[PDB]
Design a protein around this ligand. Structure first.
Ligand SMILES: N[C@@H](Cc1c[nH]c2ccccc12)C(=O)O
Ligand SMILES: [Mg+2]
Ligand SMILES: [Mg+2]
Ligand SMILES: [Mg+2]
Ligand SMILES: [Mg+2]
Ligand SMILES: [Mg+2]
Ligand SMILES: [Mg+2]
Ligand SMILES: [Mg+2]
Ligand SMILES: [Mg+2]
Ligand SMILES: [Mg+2]
Ligand SMILES: [Mg+2]
Ligand SMILES: [Mg+2]
Ligand SMILES: [Mg+2]
Ligand SMILES: [Mg+2]
Ligand SMILES: [Mg+2]
Ligand SMILES: [Mg+2]
Ligand SMILES: [Mg+2]
Ligand SMILES: [Mg+2]
Ligand SMILES: [Mg+2]
Ligand SMILES: [Mg+2]
Ligand SMILES: [Mg+2]
Ligand SMILES: [Mg+2]
Ligand SMILES: [Mg+2]
Ligand SMILES: [Mg+2]
Ligand SMILES: [Mg+2]
Ligand SMILES: [Mg+2]
Ligand SMILES: [Mg+2]
Ligand SMILES: [Mg+2]
Ligand SMILES: [Mg+2]
Ligand SMILES: [Mg+2]
Ligand SMILES: [Mg+2]
Ligand SMILES: [Mg+2]
Ligand SMILES: [Mg+2]
Ligand SMILES: [Mg+2]
Ligand SMILES: [Mg+2]
Ligand SMILES: [Mg+2]
Ligand SMILES: [Mg+2]
Ligand SMILES: [Mg+2]
Ligand SMILES: [Mg+2]
Ligand SMILES: [Mg+2]
Lengths: 209, 114, 17, 123, 118, 56
RNA sequence: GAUGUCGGCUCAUCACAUCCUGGGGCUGAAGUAGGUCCCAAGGGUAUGGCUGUUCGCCAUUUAAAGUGGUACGCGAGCUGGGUUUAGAACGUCGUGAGACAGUUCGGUCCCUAUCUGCCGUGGGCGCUGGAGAACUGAGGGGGGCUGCUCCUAGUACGAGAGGACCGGAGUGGACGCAUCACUGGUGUUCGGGUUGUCAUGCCAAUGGCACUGCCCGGUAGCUAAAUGCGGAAGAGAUAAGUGCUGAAAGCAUCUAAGCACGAAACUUGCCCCGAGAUGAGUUCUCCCUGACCCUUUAAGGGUCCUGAAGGAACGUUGAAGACGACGACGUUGAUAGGCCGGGUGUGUAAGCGCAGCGAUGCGUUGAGCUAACCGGUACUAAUGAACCGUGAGGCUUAACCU
RNA sequence: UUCCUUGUCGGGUAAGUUCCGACCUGCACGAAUGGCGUAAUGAUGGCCAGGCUGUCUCCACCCGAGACUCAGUGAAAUUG
RNA sequence: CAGGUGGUCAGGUAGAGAAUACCAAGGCGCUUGAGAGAACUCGGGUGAAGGAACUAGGCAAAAUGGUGCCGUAACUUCGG
RNA sequence: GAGGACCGAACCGACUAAUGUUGAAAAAUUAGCGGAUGACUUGUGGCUGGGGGUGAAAGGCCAAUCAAACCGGGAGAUAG
């Protein structure tokens, strides 16, 4: 099934009647407007393109504005696509709301994780540090060795080294849907999802069991 | 965070009594022992309060059977049945973590009287 | 001038006796 | 959070006063034992005429820790010190006949029903 | 990381920043326009503008609080007798920064910061 | 560490293919003085966006 | 005219002669548990006492604590305990200077990375008019571990003792990813207590310095010990093995023709990168519809007119960031600062009054102050411009319309 | 000072090639190149315990000086 | 040029003091600066539960720390 | 009011660690460390000269040089 595009509002808790507290993430899913439908004839695959949110008219370009005008839709903050399974059909201009997840029990949420900048090998790869005392010389959080001698005489591809951490697409799988609230456009999932507050989230029904 | 705050108001208890650190309080908590649900009492001195709306919490310290026990309750959880103040104590601080090292006659808190 | 300090040190120089 | 080399007080009347943890049982590379977890111990100090003597190697169950236990609503229960009850090495049944101080409800399992019943109180 | 932190360290330690903005706060009050580096002019708005709102209500306690932060009785006198009454109808935004060229000695980007009615 | 072979005058000017300075392109004219200045900077005689901001 | 040594640390990578997990044949295999051989390299594969030790012995665990290669992997990555300089002593040898893989106590470990490699991150050009988005997935990488309890069932098996396969459910250990609602750590940008001294004329109240003077609390952010999730199922083709039918060879025979099963190994399925995939792909939308001259007549050159979509630059900045880059905003404006309202933290300010001889207490009073938070608000700064980018986009052939 | 050798027995430890007490089979102790004791002393060697701790399990955050960017000045070993 | 260099002078408040903290008279701010707020290095601050499990070895850190009074063992060369 | 007595600044040293190692420095800096009325320490001048001096003895020191100083000469020593 297709998913929806939301926005991370924050985390909170839900107290249950038997004294359990469920940590939930609040995801604001406003209506997603279908702006283009792709089919096997013209495009080679089946998918829908949706937009959501609002954009100020002075910041939408002419190429983008004419794309929305052909669909008969108001400009949103972006465009996303979802592959259509066999037996699903949509129409341009149709709106899709969070009630689509009314009977869904688990979801998968993908977003962009928080950016940690340039991180070292201890933070990025859980490398053990070396001794703090006992004679150590300027080598307290350095990576250590990176290869063997003359054979192979080089460093291997995929060696674990310091570099840019975070700020990338991450998917978290099999999160329970605690509450769908169509009147306030909310979806509450159990647990934590990637990103900062106010970031875009794509929520889809779980592919595994 | 208008959305979060109004999701938060609908869960908060409305009958929470006023208390501050140093007070002797008695908290009754629902315990489930198999099939039946029962109330059990925990009485001690409030040593810390965290005020954050629904995420408010408070810590109670009691000396039971020879060993001190600190329990951190969540104010608005339905495990907490009732809170009642037995005595009002007079302290200058907001956190009474210094009571952890004191014992017996050195841990006495003077009463407020006003 | 004189030799570099690591070229005088026995520990560094005398590694294969 | 109990690990190897932790000293624990003893919460029964078997004769030990202090015991040292020497192995956290139940897995490879296991680090910590919480409340209700079996550990292998040695006796560091004992009373003159107890059921156990100094230097013995036994099992024990942790019943109190300063780190504490979490409850499903978010609560915590912490104590002032770490305590354990000695168990028989083979049967894993308590050696003592009394229990001192409370225990918590994570001992509520068919293994430790004799501990739950002797305890002065269960939090 | 630095996520959501405020303030500039300005390559000084804590006590030397505090003294430096205390001297520059008085200099702007006394002269009503000064020339400084652009990063330092922006971090000055967060020190000098809270004093002018403190000076809008004249009281013995407010004067002893402006003194504890300026340590200059000439500055405290001018804040409460001239500036506060002068800005009594303005809702924040008591200063204005105008960028000027580059300092000759080290190419620092310079700016002028002044009170809005000068 | 230090080089084993002396680098060529070609490798030296390839490394410097990125060291070029870029000129200022937008030089604005003031609306009253009619003279030039950096954008968002006061003019050399104390004007900014038509008003004399500095009597120096 | 120098290729630094044993062990430890850190970080690894391969082989398979397999330690565990997986699939099987035989058993002197009743069951449980084994013995032995064949297949299989996906993942996993101890902590301590002694000792310079690798090893080994011991203690206690684990599903298991594999065996080897890599300059007995790794000192321009760390150490320097042993060995192996100069000091000194013992035993022994020598007349002696001295000697001893005999022992003992002490003993300087340099390098700012040009090239290849690797980990990250940009600029140029190309992709054949220019530009803005969304994609396809060639191809590459990540992950793959397992215990115990319960049901089946005290069933099958066994004289008893003991005690299942197959299948299902729950809960852990180690590892990984994300996050900060909770429990906490930090919090030299917030509040308070307090010691010595100096100053603000003095009292009162404050400030500087003493490591943040010393301490006690603590907001945002970051974060683990906190708490969500993951390893799969399934499919395809197989390994060892098991077959069905079936001749050669009237029979027998898994094989020769033909057909079916069969494992964590392989190809997928799950996550992430990805059209410089030069084989440079697709779809949608947006913009440009002027003259003239010249030579060497051609994908030719120049002049005037024009400057589009868009881009960049500049400015206010960000949960983004070493710098670039990326994101939002620029008055038709909440982008940042201030301000206003709250929250949070600290813990009852100063002034004044009252009680006391005085320290001090009480009242006004949960007061005053309050950082990075939340909801608002054009007060201040985000300027009219200018700059780059053009003017309908080659040839050949085919198919349609003329 | 003992090669065999981590001798053997006891003590200390859950576990002690080190340490302490003993035995004597002294490869290869021994009497002023002194033997055996010894109170006090030692920036002396070895071993044990209490207190204490980021040494460690297993690291997290913060404050400064560099590293990074900008303007000025401006080296070095090395090199067919 | 973060080194070396004999003699004389010798204020206040606390203090035993020429130690130490803050000051006087007096003299200086050390002849590159401006930004930013990555890894990593250096110099420090704090740290949940544990507490030498680290290591060749408690290295390095942390802890103890004053004055007055009470009290203080073996051993001894009679002083400790 | 004794003492190669005790604790401890100046002063004399140099036990440990980290930094630095094309250094700030051809031996230092930071934090701790030892002696501190004596076999102490220091200023000025003097004397001992190279197979020689001096040495509480390390083959140590004798002008950043020491199992035989430095300068000049034999001297273009000799070099299978
Ligand atoms: N390594 C130190 C000490 C030293 C000086 N000269 C030496 C000669 C040899 C060995 C060490 C040294 C330095 O360079 O300052
Ligand atoms: Mg070094
Ligand atoms: Mg270091
Ligand atoms: Mg090769
Ligand atoms: Mg600087
Ligand atoms: Mg200070
Ligand atoms: Mg060579
Ligand atoms: Mg094989
Ligand atoms: Mg090797
Ligand atoms: Mg190497
Ligand atoms: Mg050595
Ligand atoms: Mg010798
Ligand atoms: Mg030899
Ligand atoms: Mg090194
Ligand atoms: Mg793959
Ligand atoms: Mg806290
Ligand atoms: Mg603090
Ligand atoms: Mg006073
Ligand atoms: Mg002996
Ligand atoms: Mg002898
Ligand atoms: Mg002899
Ligand atoms: Mg004789
Ligand atoms: Mg003799
Ligand atoms: Mg430069
Ligand atoms: Mg000097
Ligand atoms: Mg001197
Ligand atoms: Mg002094
Ligand atoms: Mg820093
Ligand atoms: Mg700690
Ligand atoms: Mg603690
Ligand atoms: Mg050890
Ligand atoms: Mg030490
Ligand atoms: Mg003396
Ligand atoms: Mg000396
Ligand atoms: Mg010193
Ligand atoms: Mg002394
Ligand atoms: Mg000698
Ligand atoms: Mg000399
Ligand atoms: Mg001659
Ligand atoms: Mg010659």
């Amino acid at each position: 099934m297709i998913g929806l595009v939301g926005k991370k509002v924050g985390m909170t808790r839900i107290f249950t009647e038997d004294g359990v507290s469920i940590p939930v993430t609040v995801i604001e899913v406003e209506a997603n407007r279908v702006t283009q439908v792709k089919d096997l004839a013209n495009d080679g695959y089946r998918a829908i393109q949706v937009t959501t949110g609002a954009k100020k008219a002075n910041r939408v370009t002419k190429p983008e504005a004419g794309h929305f005008a052909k669909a008969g839709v108001e400009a949103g903050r972006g465009l996303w696509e979802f592959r259509l399974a066999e037996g699903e059909e949509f129409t341009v201009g149709q709106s899709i709301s969070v009630e689509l997840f009314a009977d869904v029990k688990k979801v998968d949420v993908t977003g962009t994780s928080k950016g940690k900048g340039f991180a070292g090998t201890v933070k990025r790869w859980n490398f053990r540090t070396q001794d703090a005392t006992h004679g150590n010389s300027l080598s307290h959080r350095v990576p250590g060795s990176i290869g063997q001698n003359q054979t192979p005489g080089k460093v291997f591809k995929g060696k674990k080294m310091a570099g840019q951490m975070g700020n990338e697409r991450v998917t978290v799988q099999s999160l329970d849907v605690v509450r769908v609230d169509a009147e306030r456009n909310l979806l509450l999932v159990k647990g934590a999802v990637p990103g900062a507050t106010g970031s875009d989230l794509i929520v889809k029904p779980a592919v595994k069991a | 965070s208008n959305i979060i705050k109004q999701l938060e108001q609908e869960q908060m208890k409305q009958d929470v009594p006023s208390f501050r650190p140093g007070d002797t309080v008695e908290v009754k908590v629902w315990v489930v022992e198999g099939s039946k649900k029962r109330l059990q009492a925990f009485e001690g001195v409030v040593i810390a309060i965290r005020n954050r709306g629904l995420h408010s919490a408070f810590t109670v310290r009691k000396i039971s059977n020879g060993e001190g026990v600190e329990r951190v309750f969540q104010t608005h959880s339905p495990v907490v049945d009732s809170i009642s103040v037995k005595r009002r104590g007079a302290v200058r601080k907001a956190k009474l973590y210094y009571l952890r090292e004191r014992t017996g006659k050195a841990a006495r808190i003077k009463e407020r009287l006003n | 001038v004189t030799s570099k300090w690591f070229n005088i040190d026995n520990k560094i120089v005398d590694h294969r006796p | 959070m109990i690990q190897e080399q932790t000293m624990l007080n003893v919460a029964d009347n078997s004769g030990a006063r202090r015991v040292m943890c020497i192995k956290v049982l139940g897995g490879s590379h296991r680090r910590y034992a919480g409340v209700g977890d079996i550990i292998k111990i040695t006796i560091k100090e004992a009373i003159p005429r107890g059921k156990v003597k100094k230097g013995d190697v036994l099992k024990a169950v942790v019943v109190r820790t300063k780190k504490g236990v979490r409850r499903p609503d978010g609560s915590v229960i912490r104590f002032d010190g770490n305590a354990c009850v000695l168990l028989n090495n083979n049967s894993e049944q308590p050696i003592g006949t009394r229990i001192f101080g409370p225990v918590t409800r994570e001992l509520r399992s068919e293994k430790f029903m004799k501990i739950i019943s002797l305890a002065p109180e269960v939090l | 990381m630095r996520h959501r932190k405020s303030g500039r360290q300005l390559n000084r330690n804590s006590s030397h920043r505090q003294a430096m903005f205390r001297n520059m706060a008085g200099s702007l009050v006394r002269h009503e326009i000064i020339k400084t580096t652009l990063p330092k002019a922006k971090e000055l708005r967060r020190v000098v503008e809270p004093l002018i709102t403190l000076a809008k209500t004249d009281s013995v306690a407010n004067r002893r609080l402006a003194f504890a932060r300026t340590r200059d009785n000439e500055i405290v006198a001018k804040l409460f007798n001239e500036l506060g009454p002068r800005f009594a109808s303005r809702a924040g935004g008591y200063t204005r920064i105008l960028k000027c060229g580059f300092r000759a000695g080290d190419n620092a980007p310079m700016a002028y910061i002044e009170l809005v009615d000068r | 560490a230090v080089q084993q072979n002396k680098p060529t005058r070609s490798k030296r000017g390839m490394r410097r293919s990125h060291d070029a300075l870029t000129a200022v392109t937008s030089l604005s004219v003031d609306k009253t003085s009619g003279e030039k200045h950096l954008r968002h900077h006061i003019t050399a005689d104390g004007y900014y966006r038509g008003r004399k901001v500095i009597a120096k």
